[PDB]
Each structure stands twice: as structure tokens, then as C-alpha cells.
Ligand binder design. Structure first.
Ligand code: F1P
Ligand code: F1P
Lengths: 324, 325
């Protein structure tokens, strides 16, 4: 089901737009927003917090358990809205977190659930997934909320059709991605991204980790030179995700190749940075631009998993919903 | 070899830090809104400082230098009353580039007079000198020096340096125990876990293992690990749980990892048996200083694992002591 779900990304964008239009005039997102989630939903929370800041607001993201047990170490301050993100809407930690919150609560989930019952409003984006690994729901949740955020902040709406078609372009790379997995049997991998693409790198790494029971890491693009690069050699694939690369990116690619690693560049640029593999995606509004990158990293993780005889639908030791 | 010698200078580093603090305490006033910038281990130290700043009623945010340089708009920086640039060498290009773009007051934290100190309004020069490419005792020394300055600035009483230094001497007493774990359980990957102030310590611990042993190491906020990340832990994995005051969930988590076949080392300030295979109890200190004794433990673990693999922690492959552009 994992592959089928990744391929439903284009439709997920359309479903998200529909939900946005249904609730847009029922809730107005404020300036100070706290985002809470676990696992992939935490990485989505980080992404939402980032785009909130990008558009002039003040967003902070924290893992549910850190809010539950160590909130004093985080710069939360006054919260005008608390957003709880949970694909299942049943994760014990998010429910525990929200019951401690008194301010307005907005839930983001795929279904009517325990979560929606404890929130004042909710974005129920029906990007249903049977797989334990979150795929198109991440992308769909992001778009639905982004539309709502832009709307609340007085910005023009994004073109859902254009963005959905952009993800169809990402899916055209399926065979090429399969070829990467077939031609280079990497033993570990590093995902790199800056700004909005950093949370995407974190999510990408988790996809690879869950689906492939793999050694995968993720870092803000240039932070990797600070010790982290020591574990990259001829058995490593480095995935650099960048919208508009500059000289430092070319130097970084060269640096990794000098260590023997192979480099895959996913960008919105026609520039040759010296990469071994290249995936060019349609450039969109800066805030929506990360969307087409998700299906690419999801497909890469899926095919690497299959190449190891693993079942991405039900990774060993994992539960679909973490409960306590 | 200098790495082990440097790890063992942790106790003295605390004393050196206290001396610097007392020399500059009335020359530097720390504000409410502070931005912390650093790279690599210095970034993880920045996260720790930002957290303790929040813990004490201030507003601290930490960012890797390059993210501030090229993607600051995606972060909740807001109004900055002070920018703190952390760099052991004081020569990292990214920190120099970051600070020159800032107009507000700038404080540097480094081990030596350098390019960094020359562009800051003032600096905490803590002479915890290190020849190893891997940062060790300078991390805790920098932390203590600033922590004292923060407490003083915020009207709180001073921490007892001698007591904290002694606490790290207790950490070092576990050297044999740690060496023997490395010699008996040949783990192939490792996961460090910590919450609150111990999360940045887990991040730093993981980097120490990564740099010193060219190892597969990961770090996560304690309970976040159940959310998919735990899939890579099995009988070849050592899970290191760092916790000051464990409760019911910690015992359950330890048991969950053992059920996957992994062995668990618990480093805590509690005598409670959570079911761990290995146990290291450290002296409990003031909440803000409590993380200090944990550093030499993880540094020693990374060092011995490196030696067991015939690797030289002083000069990890591919690494430059100072990253320049
Ligand atoms: O709170 P949710 O978004 O339902 O889910 C959070 C999550 O960590 O739960 C356990 C696993 O299924 C993970 O793959 C998933 O991302
Ligand atoms: O800015 P600094 O704190 O000098 O150093 C930052 C750092 O990443 O530089 C490269 C290596 O030596 C690393 O071990 C070190 O932590």
C-alpha cells in the first residue's frame, strides 16, 4: 500500500484544497502559533512553524513528549493557537499534550478521532493511509494548512491544480529512482536541506529509516561539514535538496565526491554541480516549493526497502499508532 | 594521543571556567532575548545554552551558523538583544560571516584570542585548550562559564564550582566500567536519548561517537524514539538513556528496547533499576548544572569505542579542525 499511497499525492493536493475552502472562513490563524506532533508529524510541525515565520508570524514546533515533560526549556511564550498534528488522531502523547492546553486548539488529521474531539476546530484531510509509514498525508496536510495560513495572513491563494500537477512530475521520476537503487547499492545515506527543505530532509531520513531499517541521517545543508561528513565514503549516497544553488553547493558536492560518495541533487535548477544523479523539479511559490520533493524521497526510500526484501507497509517493531 | 587526556581535564576546565566568569561578570550584562550561533558541537552547545536561558526566564534561540546566513526568515529570531557566537577555535568562517551581518551586541565564547574575539564586543575566553579535532572538555567548560554569567545576570546565586568539578571527577571514575562495556558488547550502532537539557547532550554524545569512531550513531528526545526511529535498534544496538529523574515511561521504554534485542545503558541521577543492562549513576546537581557530569561519560564511551576499532579520535578521517570557506 505504501507505493499506492505515495502515488496518491496529486489527488491528496486536490483533497487538501477542498478542505481548505470548507474551513477557511471558520477559523483565522493568528500570529503566535505552537505546533505539536510526534515522529513525521513533528517534522511536519517544524515545517509549518518555519513557513509561519517566513510569512511574518511566529511559529514554534516541539515534539509532544518534550512539551509534556520539559516545556520550560523551550521558548513557547504566549500562544494564540495550538496546532496538534496527528495522522491517526489517536497518538496518546498528542492527546495528553492537548488536554493540558487551555488556548484555542486546531487539529490536523486524516479522520474524525480522539484528536478532533478535543480540538476547537480541525483540518480533516482524508489522505487515508494503510501503511505504517506516512507518505502523501504529509504533503496533503502541509498544503491544506499552507492555504489556510496564506489566507489568514492576507495573501493570495496558491493554485492547487498547478501544485498537484507538479507532484505528477515528481512521480515521472519513479523509474529513474529505481535505477539509482539498482545501480548504486549504497549502505548509508545523508539527506541535506536548508530552510523549508531541512524538515523535508529530516522526514526523508525517517522514511528511509522506517521503510528500509537503514542507516540514514539528515542535516541543515552546510552543517554537514562539521564532523558529520566523516561517515560518508564510497558506500554513501548523499542527497542534496536545494532550490537555488550557489558556489558553496558545488564545492560541497565536490567535497563528498572526493570522499568517494555519490551525490544525488534534487533541485529547481538546471545547474550542473558535479552530481552523479540529478532530479529537477518544477519551481513553485517559495512556500509551496518543498511539496514536489516529498514524493521523490518517499519513492527512493520505498525502492531501497524493496531491494532489501523488506515490507515498507509494516516495518519491524513499529505500530501504526504509538500508544501508552 | 590527546583526546583522552583532554576528556580527563574536565574537572580543571570547570575551575578555569569559574575564573573567567568572575573576571568578566561585572563587565558583561546578559539580556532577555539572546540568539546563540555555532557550528557542529558548538551548535549543540548553543542549543543547550538557549534551553537553559529559557529555563531561567529568558528567551533563547539557537541556530546553526549557515541557517542564519542563508535561511534566517524561517526561524523565530525576532528582536535580538545579544548575539552569542560560539567557536572553540574562534576561526570558523561561518561564525565570522554570521556575526559580521549582526548589528546588535556580540559576545564570543572561545578557547583563544582569535578572529572571533576581534569582531565581538566582548568574549568569554575559556582556556580549555584542545589539540584533538574532537571537542571534549571545552564543551562543559564553555557551558559552565556562561551558565554562571547567566545566573549572575538574572539575579540568581552562584553555582559551587568546586562541587561541580568534583561531580565530573565522579564521572571519570567510571572509565573502567565504560571501557569494559566496549570490550564486552561489540555494538554496531547506537542511540542516545535525553529530554530537556539532556537532549542537546544526546546530540553532542552522538556526534562524539560519529566523529571519534566513524560510527552509526543517532540521538533523539527520549520518547520520540518510539515514533519509527526505534526500528533500527536490535541485538547489535546499544541504547544509551540519559535521565535525571526517571518515571514509569522510562522503565517501559527500556524494556521495549530489550524486547527488540538491544542492550541498554542508563546514565542517571537515580538508583532506580529500570531494567538496564548497564548502569551509571552520577551526582545530582542544580537542574541547570546537572547535565555537566554526563559529558565525560559519553566522551569516554566514544573514545574507547574508537580505540576498539583502531581509529584515531585525535584526527578523524576527512575532518579539518577548522571548517573554512
Ligand atoms: O500521530 P500520528 O501522526 O498518527 O503518527 C506519528 C507516528 O510516529 O506514529 C508511529 C508510526 O506509525 C509513525 O510512522 C508515525 O509517523
Ligand atoms: O567553530 P569551532 O567550535 O571551532 O568548531 C566547529 C567544528 O565542527 O569544527 C570542525 C571539527 O573540529 C569539529 O570537531 C568542530 O566541532
Amino acid at each position: 500500500k505504501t507505493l499506492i499511497e505515495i502515488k496518491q499525492t496529486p489527488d491528496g493536493i486536490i483533497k487538501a484544497d477542498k478542505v481548505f475552502n470548507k474551513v477557511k472562513d471558520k477559523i483565522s490563524l493568528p500570529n503566535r502559533i505552537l505546533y505539536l506532533g510526534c515522529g513525521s508529524s513533528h517534522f511536519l510541525s517544524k515545517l509549518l512553524a518555519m513557513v509561519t515565520n517566513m510569512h511574518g508570524g511566529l511559529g514554534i514546533a516541539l515534539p509532544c513528549s518534550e512539551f509534556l515533560y520539559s516545556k520550560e526549556t523551550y521558548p513557547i511564550g504566549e500562544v494564540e493557537l495550538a496546532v496538534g498534528i496527528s495522522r491517526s488522531g489517536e497518538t496518546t502523547e498528542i492527546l495528553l499534550a492537548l488536554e493540558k492546553i487551555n488556548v484555542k486548539k486546531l487539529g490536523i488529521t486524516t479522520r474524525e478521532s480522539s484528536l478532533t474531539r478535543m480540538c476547537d476546530y480541525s483540518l480533516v484531510v482524508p489522505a487515508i493511509e494503510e501503511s505504517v509509514v506516512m507518505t502523501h498525508s504529509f504533503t496533503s496536510f502541509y498544503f491544506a494548512y499552507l492555504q489556510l495560513l496564506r489566507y489568514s495572513y492576507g495573501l493570495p491563494p496558491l493554485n492547487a491544480g498547478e501544485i498537484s500537477k507538479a507532484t505528477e512530475k515528481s512521480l515521472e521520476y519513479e523509474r529513474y529512482i529505481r535505477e539509482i537503487v539498482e545501480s548504486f547499492d549504497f549502505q548509508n545515506i545523508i539527506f541535506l536541506g536548508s530552510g523549508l527543505l531541512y524538515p523535508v530532509a529530516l522526514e526523508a531520513s525517517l522514511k528511509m529509516k522506517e521503510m528500509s531499517i537503514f542507516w540514514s541521517e539528515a542535516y541543515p545543508t552546510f552543517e554537514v561539514r562539521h564532523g558529520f561528513k566523516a561517515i560518508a565514503d564510497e558506500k554513501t549516497l548523499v542527497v542534496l535538496m536545494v532550490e537555488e544553488p550557489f558556489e558553496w553547493h558545488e564545492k560541497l558536492v565536490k567535497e563528498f565526491k572526493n570522499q568517494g560518495a555519490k551525490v544525488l541533487v534534487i533541485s529547481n535548477s538546471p545547474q550542473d554541480l558535479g552530481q552523479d544523479y540529478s532530479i529537477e523539479l518544477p519551481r513553485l511559490s517559495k512556500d509551496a516549493n518543498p511539496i514536489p520533493y516529498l514524493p521523490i524521497v518517499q519513492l527512493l526510500s520505498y525502492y531501497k526497502a524493496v531491494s532489501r526484501g523488506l515490507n515498507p507497509d509494516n516495518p519491524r517493531f513499529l505500530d501504526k499508532v504509538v500508544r501508552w
